[PDB]
From Swiss-Prot, chain A:
Homotetramer; may further associate as a homohexadecamer. Part of the pre-integration complex (PIC) which is composed of viral genome, matrix protein, Vpr and integrase. Interacts with human SMARCB1/INI1 and human PSIP1/LEDGF isoform 1. Interacts with human KPNA3; this interaction might play a role in nuclear import of the pre-integration complex. Interacts with human NUP153; this interaction might play a role in nuclear import of the pre-integration complex. Mg(2+) 3 binds at N53, N105, E141. Zn(2+) binds at H12, H16, C40, C43. The chain holds residues 1148 to 1416 of 1435 of the full protein. A zinc finger (Integrase-type) spans 3-44. It comes from Human immunodeficiency virus type 1 group M subtype B (isolate NY5). This is Integrase.
């Protein structure tokens, strides 16, 4: 916020990037990023999105769900291809992880009435088709094929298919170290959830703020301008927006009216 | 198409491949819009119905519109059969018989009898009737393919007036109606859904103002 | 090809390179799609069997379809030879006997034989028969090259009806059968294989409704 | 259009697809600029008013220009009707009265009427009047589409003067003014908005210094 | 090229630049393959030997094949001289003797001699003999340019049979042999050189059948 | 343009769109290199001045050169008016009066007057005078866009002499001087601005040796 | 250029812009290689010397070749002047004297002189002489453009003989000599400079062997 | 020069460029490109 609003505006005028990118790059709340994006005439939540895939192994069907922001994996083999078991797995993963949007692909079992009722009860919006993220399409299939590679390797040291599959997915989630960062998928997903909690705390702090019409003065001019919408107050200054322009003014040059 | 020799007579000629290639590429590269109506009419001038149906069938994609226009062609053929009396009985030799609903559509008439119809005395403009049927069908198709209506047009708070008026007139052209209601709409509706500043400006301008004054005053 | 002469005797005309270039590029470009069926018939109007063979041999790759059409040409030439009675008696000057199964294909017959057959009164429609044989061969090739059936098309719960109807008609044209069966399937499978909301809308609309009514009602 | 034959009378033919394709592509690729004003005339020599309207209607987008030119055509038609009064009374056989305001636009006249009027004795330059009305409409539309005036052009602190004077002249041509005003602005405006070094060099050159000496002095 | 006027005489003309440009481009981008053999025969109808040699010399690259075809032309000219009776001595007025070995190649005979021979009574098909010599040369050239033989091709474990049979027929078409052995080999080893699963499927289908069934069964 | 009719008399015609499109694109694409001077005379032969103006006005940008050529045309017209006195008095029809400074440029003369001047006996090559004025304007445009003079080209220490002589002649063709000075400079500068080995070879060859022997002996 | 009219006398024709564009692009883009020499004769048949000069001077770059060609044209003009003495005396009625050295180049003669000379009886093929002079210039410029001779070409041991014999033929056809000398070269050097294994194989095969068995002898 | 600068920026991350007071290095296009890319400028080496 140390003159980062002007930098974000220049970056959005030259690139028109995603609001979260500007928020993370310049350490800004998502509200100012969203308003800067909306200020653009040619422009108009990664966590909580999961992708489900089905595979055939040993003549049996296995369903695997994977996160997009962290890539956490869950997998289970189903005795028979029915929508009831997929609905059961969906409600179990809803009751185990915070799920907001379930993304899938085209499938007869995905369009069943049972899964629709299950997702309607949980309030989770479900859809299928092109992935929401324009990138990372290959991540899901690469992770699936890595799991397929490891299940065959660890099958010889197991007595049952389900136990072997679960051990393989446990190894992939925990005992498989990645590249950048070099830690478990559980660690990255818990960090993502923690940052989501912190951003929700920021959201409720912003919710504490309300209309609170504020008048402002610039460069000690004799005139008083306004009204302007209050955005944030802190560090002896107040950042506000008006006429699609966001600016920070010292408190000594502003007044707040209930 | 049927073309006239230099100080000669009317003779038939094969369709140039470039004409049909340009037609199909402009159809597939440009979305359906009223401006394609003149483009079709400027290329099929003096063309036999056989050329018309060969040009129509070569279009790839959006075959639902093709089926709809074929259905409208069939219903127009039925209308022609039902309103124009069917001349029953064998006509005397030497005169070409009345074209049927299939004959105008080109589904049963070969090129020889098409030329005979063209050279018949008095001339029989069956090709022109089929062309106007195709024009009506394409008008229905472009009415179908209209992205939105006209009463819901609204100028955005940051939307420039130039783009707003351009899209308003685009949709107005996309609308199929009489000229009087078109004039009424272009005189009343556009000012109602403008930005407040230019709305008050045009209200100050008052009635009987040409659009050039409105657009010059709305700048800024 | 065989071009009619202005109040004279018709003479052989050289093949323009434009037609060959356009044919080869359109064949190599997209696919063995049904839209090539009319295009071909537009590029071979009144052409000799030698010209048809020259056009056929210009293609590059996809020789399996070439083998298919050659085998079908051989079998239908044998059928034509077995059904048409063998000509008997002396052949007068200025006339020629009925073309053989190899002659209609143009593999052995020379251009002079084709010109003589064309100038013979009445003209022999050998070129037209060979063209319709090629049309049947291309139809069966397109039948083979369709990687989908008509009864397997499904519409997604949020999939718009537009592309659903589009693909339905694409597969309908890709499928070859009697016209009555096509009408029955386009009247039944359309309503029977849609989303529940538009399915009940169509059931409310009743049978025999035009496709424009159903496409306007299913909007939303 | 209507062009002469080989030692024969004037004959009518359809507009060549190449000409209209080039016109529409140069309209879409290049924005409304003065250089399109003469080009259009080079593409509209001896063209009937119906052909002019057909060429006009194929333009895609920028419908505000179309509305402006239609309004100007209507007002010029009214002016022509009021200045040249509509004569009353029957017309002698073999002759037709002068074209009306609706007739020049082609909305109420067929192609046969245009052909009869163009070749009539004395000749009727209805197409030429329509062309000049279109020229006036193009002049006012290029006045509209110019986004910058001529008094707000300043050379950069170290920008090369070549493109500066080039764009200055380009904007000057698109300005509707008088000859003496153009002379005054090309004598005074350019020197008041130049870099100090060669602008003082120009002031040393005195009045009447043509652009060759000024450009050879401002080198480097 | 030399062309016959409608109901008139035979007049020599220069080769259009379009034909030569298309020929050189297709030679450059489509390096010698069987399908180029018909292309030449489509671009050499009614052409003098001088035109044939001119369009032959315009090729760029692969001059080894050009020298091979030049040598074959020379040896065929020698064979024609040694077989056809070479006449000498007096020549009847209004006529000229048949072209010699150097004349058919066009190395020594002037263009006027070719023009006179083409229009002679009876006409001399020297150009057609030169064309068929070039055809034989191209056949042996494409035989030389074969990437591999026909009895060594196999099908990969992850290779569908479609492109397998495509390349099989592509290599088979490049074989200069009798049709009977071609049919014999295309009925036996086409399955013997495939993947074991579809191999056993075809074997269960029966020894020999129509290839459409053998490809529909092998689908998937 | 003015094109001779088929075995007939000279008739007026409009400029084909293809020629003007090619001219404008080739002018705007690369640069104002001297090679535009010949190509211009390859596209404006036997053309009336108004068509020259139409071709001139279609240039996109580069208005400084347009002002240059307009001013030079005006001053040349003034010189023509002052050197050639005005012939007053009654003028017989068919052979109009002497063109003025504005009539030669075609800004006031109409198509009929230009046709009359073209068909006038004795001939009036006013179009040729305007063309040569345009040639002078193009020469001074090349002078404007000349990157540098000839007096500073020096061959690189290891650069091959081929590129050196090529660029030397490229700059030479753009120079404006008399033929004798050009011969002197091409005799002197080439030997005075070469590498030590090439210049020692040159001086061993001595004076009077053409560039052929020079650059066949300096090879290596 | 110069083309005879159908059922009429020869008439002057303007130069096609497409021909000039194709010529200049094919000259500039590929190379200064022998295959462009025949192409020139394809694009220069029946043209005035002015047309040849315009075609020559429109090339961009390689101005050293243009200077060499101009100098050789001047020296051939001097040769023509010395072989044919300048005939003095009055000009024959309707029979202009034979072109001088500067007249064949076209630098001092107006187009009307060549137009009269082409149609004069007896015909004067001065344009053909100029074309042959240009051909000689092209031959010498393509000789000097060849970077390597044929007496120093050697085959590397680590590449197939295919490209070696290809480049050997490239260098052989790029050199101008007698036909018998070329035959001796292609009989001796093709085997005297091959790889040792292929050399011994061909020595075992013996002399008098065609190139086909030579290339099929040591494949790989 | 501006074209080369923007190409090298697109191929590698550059935050500062050391050039002299040459006209080409200080040209309007080069300055516009470097300011658009957010690259600091330092004259004199
Ligand atoms: O259709 P394409 O394969 O793109 O070839 C076109 C076509 O030429 P052809 O009909 O001889 O193939 C154009 O002719 P039109 O369709 O405009 O009548 C021609 O344009 P011009 O004849 O007006 O020059 C154009 O050339 P260009 O791309 O230079 O505009 C040329 O393209 P190619 O030169 O790539 O064959
Ligand atoms: O020279 P040709 O082989 O006879 O072909 C010509 C040529 O077209 P291309 O250069 O694209 O082949 C003409 O163009 P120009 O040479 O006159 O510039 C064109 O005339 P247009 O440009 O007016 O169309 C004419 O067509 P037409 O006979 O309709 O005038 C067309 O002949 P084809 O259409 O028979 O190929
Ligand atoms: Zn944006």
């Amino acid at each position: 916020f140390l003159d980062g609003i002007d930098k974000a505006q220049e970056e959005h005028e030259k690139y028109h990037s995603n609001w979260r990118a500007m928020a993370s790059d310049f350490n800004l709340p998502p509200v100012v990023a969203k308003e800067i994006v909306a200020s653009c005439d040619k422009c108009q939540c990664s966590p909580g999105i999961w992708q489900l895939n089905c595979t055939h192994l040993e003549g049996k069907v296995i369903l695997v769900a994977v996160h997009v922001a962290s890539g956490y994996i869950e997998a289970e083999v189903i005795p028979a291809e029915t929508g009831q078991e997929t609905a059961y797995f969906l409600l179990k993963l809803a009751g185990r992880w915070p799920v907001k949007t379930v993304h899938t692909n085209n499938g007869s079992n995905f369009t069943s009435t049972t899964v629709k009722a299950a997702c309607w009860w949980a309030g989770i919006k479900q859809e299928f088709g092109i992935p929401y993220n324009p990138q990372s399409q290959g991540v899901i299939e690469s992770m699936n094929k890595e799991l397929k590679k490891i299940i065959g390797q660890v099958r010889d040291q197991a007595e049952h298919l389900k136990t072997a599959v679960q051990m393989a997915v446990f190894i992939h989630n925990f005992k498989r170290k990645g590249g950048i960062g070099g830690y478990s998928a559980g660690e990255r997903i818990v960090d993502i959830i923690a940052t989501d909690i912190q951003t929700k705390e920021l959201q409720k702090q912003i919710t504490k703020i309300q209309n609170f019409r504020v008048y402002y003065r610039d460069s000690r001019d004799p005139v008083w301008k306004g009204p302007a919408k209050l955005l944030w107050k802190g560090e002896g200054a107040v950042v506000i927006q008006d006429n699609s322009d966001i600016k920070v003014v010292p408190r000594r040059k502003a007044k707040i009216i209930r | 198409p049927i073309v006239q020799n230099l100080q000669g007579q009317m003779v038939h000629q094969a369709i140039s491949p470039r004409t049909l290639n340009a037609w199909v590429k402009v159809v597939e590269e440009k979305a359906f819009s009223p401006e394609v109506i003149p483009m079709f009419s400027a290329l099929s001038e003096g063309a036999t119905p056989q050329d018309l149906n060969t040009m129509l069938n070569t279009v790839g994609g959006h075959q639902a519109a093709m089926q709809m226009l074929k259905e409208t062609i069939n219903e127009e053929a039925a209308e022609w059969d039902r309103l124009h009396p069917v001349h029953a009985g064998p006509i005397a030799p030497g005169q070409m018989r009345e074209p049927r609903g299939s004959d105008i559509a080109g589904t049963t008439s070969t090129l020889q009898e098409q030329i005979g119809w063209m050279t018949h005395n008095p001339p029989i403009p069956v090709g022109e009737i089929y062309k106007r049927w195709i024009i009506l069908g394409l008008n229905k198709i472009v009415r179908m393919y209209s992205p939105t209506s006209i009463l819901d047009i609204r100028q955005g708070p940051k939307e420039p007036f130039r783009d707003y008026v351009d899209r308003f007139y685009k949709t107005l052209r996309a609308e199929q109606a009489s000229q009087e209601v078109k004039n009424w709409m272009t005189e009343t509706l556009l000012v109602q859904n403008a930005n407040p500043d230019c709305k008050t400006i045009l209200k100050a301008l008052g009635p009987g103002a040409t659009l050039e004054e409105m657009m010059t005053a709305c700048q800024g």
